[PDB]
Design an enzyme around this catalytic site. Structure first.
Site, PDB file in Angstrom:
ATOM      1  N   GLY A   1       2.982   5.463  10.424  1.00 17.94           N
ATOM      2  CA  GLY A   1       4.354   5.357   9.974  1.00 17.94           C
ATOM      3  C   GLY A   1       5.053   4.064  10.345  1.00 17.94           C
ATOM      4  O   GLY A   1       6.170   3.821   9.870  1.00 17.94           O
TER       5      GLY A   1
ATOM      6  N   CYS B   1       4.126   1.018   9.551  1.00 19.66           N
ATOM      7  CA  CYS B   1       3.983  -0.096   8.623  1.00 19.66           C
ATOM      8  C   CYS B   1       5.330  -0.490   8.042  1.00 19.66           C
ATOM      9  O   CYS B   1       6.208   0.347   7.813  1.00 19.66           O
ATOM     10  CB  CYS B   1       3.015   0.244   7.495  1.00 19.66           C
ATOM     11  SG  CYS B   1       1.342   0.276   8.126  1.00 19.66           S
TER      12      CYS B   1
ATOM     13  N   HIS C   1       0.807  -1.216   0.000  1.00 24.11           N
ATOM     14  CA  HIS C   1       0.000   0.000   0.000  1.00 24.11           C
ATOM     15  C   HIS C   1       0.843   1.270   0.000  1.00 24.11           C
ATOM     16  O   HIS C   1       0.266   2.359  -0.051  1.00 24.11           O
ATOM     17  CB  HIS C   1      -1.014  -0.002   1.162  1.00 24.11           C
ATOM     18  CG  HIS C   1      -0.438   0.292   2.515  1.00 24.11           C
ATOM     19  ND1 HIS C   1      -0.182  -0.698   3.438  1.00 24.11           N
ATOM     20  CD2 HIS C   1      -0.118   1.462   3.122  1.00 24.11           C
ATOM     21  CE1 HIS C   1       0.286  -0.158   4.550  1.00 24.11           C
ATOM     22  NE2 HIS C   1       0.341   1.150   4.383  1.00 24.11           N
TER      23      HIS C   1
HETATM   24  C1  LIG Z   1       0.890   2.015   8.281  1.00 23.69           C
HETATM   25  O1  LIG Z   1       1.945   2.824   8.811  1.00 23.69           O
HETATM   26  C2  LIG Z   1      -0.421   2.179   9.047  1.00 23.69           C
HETATM   27  C3  LIG Z   1      -0.256   1.657  10.476  1.00 23.69           C
HETATM   28  C4  LIG Z   1      -1.478   1.961  11.330  1.00 23.69           C
HETATM   29  C5  LIG Z   1      -1.589   3.448  11.634  1.00 23.69           C
HETATM   30  C6  LIG Z   1      -2.030   3.527  13.093  1.00 23.69           C
HETATM   31  N1  LIG Z   1      -1.645   2.257  13.658  1.00 23.69           N
HETATM   32  C7  LIG Z   1      -1.329   1.377  12.707  1.00 23.69           C
HETATM   33  O2  LIG Z   1      -0.988   0.241  12.899  1.00 23.69           O
HETATM   34  N2  LIG Z   1      -1.467   1.432   8.360  1.00 23.69           N
HETATM   35  C8  LIG Z   1      -2.564   2.024   7.929  1.00 23.69           C
HETATM   36  O3  LIG Z   1      -2.754   3.225   8.057  1.00 23.69           O
HETATM   37  C9  LIG Z   1      -3.608   1.172   7.261  1.00 23.69           C
HETATM   38  C10 LIG Z   1      -3.586   1.448   5.754  1.00 23.69           C
HETATM   39  C11 LIG Z   1      -4.176   0.336   4.883  1.00 23.69           C
HETATM   40  C12 LIG Z   1      -5.656   0.121   5.180  1.00 23.69           C
HETATM   41  C13 LIG Z   1      -3.409  -0.961   5.117  1.00 23.69           C
HETATM   42  C14 LIG Z   1      -4.095   0.747   3.415  1.00 23.69           C
HETATM   43  N3  LIG Z   1      -4.904   1.585   7.778  1.00 23.69           N
HETATM   44  C15 LIG Z   1      -5.211   1.455   9.072  1.00 23.69           C
HETATM   45  O4  LIG Z   1      -4.490   0.912   9.908  1.00 23.69           O
HETATM   46  O5  LIG Z   1      -6.492   2.009   9.472  1.00 23.69           O
HETATM   47  C16 LIG Z   1      -6.915   2.004  10.837  1.00 23.69           C
HETATM   48  C17 LIG Z   1      -6.263   3.135  11.611  1.00 23.69           C
HETATM   49  C18 LIG Z   1      -5.465   4.077  10.973  1.00 23.69           C
HETATM   50  C19 LIG Z   1      -4.891   5.103  11.716  1.00 23.69           C
HETATM   51  C20 LIG Z   1      -5.127   5.157  13.089  1.00 23.69           C
HETATM   52  N4  LIG Z   1      -5.899   4.231  13.685  1.00 23.69           N
HETATM   53  C21 LIG Z   1      -6.461   3.230  12.982  1.00 23.69           C
END
Ligand SMILES: *[C@H](O)[C@H](C[C@@H]1CCNC1=O)NC(=O)[C@H](CC(C)(C)C)NC(=O)OCc1cccnc1
Ligand SMILES: *[C@H](O)[C@H](C[C@@H]1CCNC1=O)NC(=O)[C@H](CC(C)(C)C)NC(=O)OCc1cccnc1
Lengths: 306, 306
Positions: A143, A145, A41
């Site tokens: 950040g 991921c 992604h």
């Molecule tokens: C990647 O860095 C990120 C990690 C998330 C962000 C907050 N904690 C995490 O573990 N992943 C995402 O933002 C992910 C994107 C995809 C759907 C895989 C395209 N979405 C996500 O985790 O959504 C739920 C979320 C986002 C942000 C804060 N809380 C929950």
């Protein structure tokens, strides 16, 4: 003595962490030999992440769209391909810090260390278990991921997890390093949710043995139970069934403590039916299920890694 | 989101760990530039450790009595001296992996990461707090002496702990890296014991803020309390007094959550007086006191280290 949630030393994995930036999105990659692995992604933007088609998105990409930074040094991307939910960026430099490694997929109930990273810089390390529902109870911010989970066996790093997302209950989901998700999750924004979990029974028993080894004995009793009679109680409290293989795996800890596995099951039964009565076990007031029998033997015996 | 007991990435410290053998005794040393630091009781044998005189023991030693192994490579000792309870072995090779570092002494209530080591090989990493009674609740087996505790600040390793011994309650005692013991302990076999501990109040409040940040709110209430009225309750439950400086240090977490510090004190009061009523906070059924306000801000915000 003592018993702590212990991670593996992280140095071998720190030397592989890089920063991957594509367009507006920045996350972590894992640099092994001349390939950088990262969540696919990264090729997405905020309106792409609703319902994307990554094959279409990726053919539109150029090598030079991918900015890879290893510390303060930029790595030239010379190829790219998709493997399930991960991207493989071929770079012109093999990582001189590449440890001996394997890509393994772990089982629910197994533990691993997480090296939490932001912008390719490691932030902290901690131990996780794969829940029966294929989530992990991690600590991950935006950040993070591309942060990876791993175990180390003498000198060999077995990578088992790459972080992708957080579910609405605050737990975390990701893939193995071949890009296949743990559990019924997709790298898209939908109404996905964890779904029901259970307690990892064999691990709880392992931890009770850890406690006995460390001098906590108040929960022991003279009673015993059959495996079937224990499993009737396990089901009532949402514990997984204990198998004869679990009993076999607990043999060494049984032998070290002189407490038969089924005897320790009777203790767990009473703990489940009476609670703790204001007492603690290894500094916890709850039954702990994220130490495997291996974790207990390793810590309560002293195995190292080169 | 999520909140885990998180250690610092250990790579910078792994590159400093060596094995020190003298006579029959083997333990760990810390190799920085051309000096190896290790506990001075390495010069002792099983009958020396009852009541030794280390100055007399050390003049009887030769450089070649000290076998130092960095991995599979032997370091030539060219000098030795004693500094309080540590030995400094001068070696003919400066450690090319020496990070930027400081020797700092920490305060009770502060946390640090422990890199547990055996035979100069790192085994695991975990987070510890210095208890008010100057012990740490570690996980240490025979051969772990010389393992070090540390914090990392951007790129700089602040070493604060070297492991020396276990006390009869299973807790651990050691020195700073100048060889001065934390607390009223000596590196001899006597009837030493930990002595009474207290709960680190400011840390408990920090962790309650961590919980609110992460969605645990059931313990919040509309009541408030004065600092003096809270401290009357703290004393009854063996909690340390909260100071105005503690209140000030909790300001940022107060501001992030919108919960005044004294309001969170009223919540802690009720938790202490009513217990938890079968509920949990951040997966714990006890009030947790080994996260500092800094630890909570770091984890609940995402600071990294290069
Ligand atoms: C990647 O860095 C990120 C990690 C998330 C962000 C907050 N904690 C995490 O573990 N992943 C995402 O933002 C992910 C994107 C995809 C759907 C895989 C395209 N979405 C996500 O985790 O959504 C739920 C979320 C986002 C942000 C804060 N809380 C929950
Ligand atoms: C050094 O490797 C060792 C570390 C101990 C061993 C078990 N857990 C530990 O933390 N330190 C000692 O053996 C220490 C020696 C000196 C008194 C400092 C000379 N003694 C000690 O810790 O005695 C208590 C003990 C020893 C072994 C097992 N349990 C308790």
């Amino acid at each position: 003595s003592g018993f702590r949630k212990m991670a593996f030393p992280s140095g071998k994995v720190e030397g592989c962490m890089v920063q991957v930036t594509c367009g507006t999105t920045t996350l972590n990659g894992l640099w092994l030999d001349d390939v950088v692995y990262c969540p696919r992604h990264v090729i997405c933007t905020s309106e792409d992440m609703l319902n994307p088609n990554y094959e279409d998105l990726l053919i539109r990409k150029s090598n030079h769209n991918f900015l890879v930074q290893a510390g303060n040094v930029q790595l030239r991307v010379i190829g790219h391909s998709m493997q399930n939910c991960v991207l493989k960026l071929k770079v012109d430099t093999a990582n001189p810090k590449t440890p001996k490694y394997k890509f393994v997929r772990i089982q629910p109930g197994q533990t691993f260390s997480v090296l939490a990273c932001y912008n390719g810089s490691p932030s902290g390390v901690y131990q996780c278990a794969m829940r029966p529902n294929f989530t992990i109870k991690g600590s991950f911010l935006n950040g993070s991921c591309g942060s990876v989970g791993f175990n180390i066996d003498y000198d060999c790093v077995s990578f088992c997890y790459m972080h992708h997302m957080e579910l609405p209950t605050g737990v975390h989901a990701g893939t193995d390093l071949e890009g296949n998700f743990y559990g019924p999750f997709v790298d898209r924004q939908t109404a996905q949710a964890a779904g029901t979990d259970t307690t990892i029974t064999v691990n709880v028993l392992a931890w009770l043995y850890a406690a006995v080894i460390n001098g906590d004995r108040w929960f022991l009793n003279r009673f015993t139970t059959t495996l079937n009679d224990f499993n009737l109680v396990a089901m009532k409290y949402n514990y997984e069934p204990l198998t004869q293989d679990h009993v076999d795996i607990l043999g060494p800890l049984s032998a070290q403590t002189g407490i038969a596995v089924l005897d320790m099951c009777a203790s767990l039964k009473e703990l489940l039916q009476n609670g703790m009565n204001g007492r603690t076990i290894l500094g916890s007031a709850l039954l702990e299920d994220e130490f495997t029998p291996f974790d207990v033997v390793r810590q309560c015996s002293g195995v190292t890694f080169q």
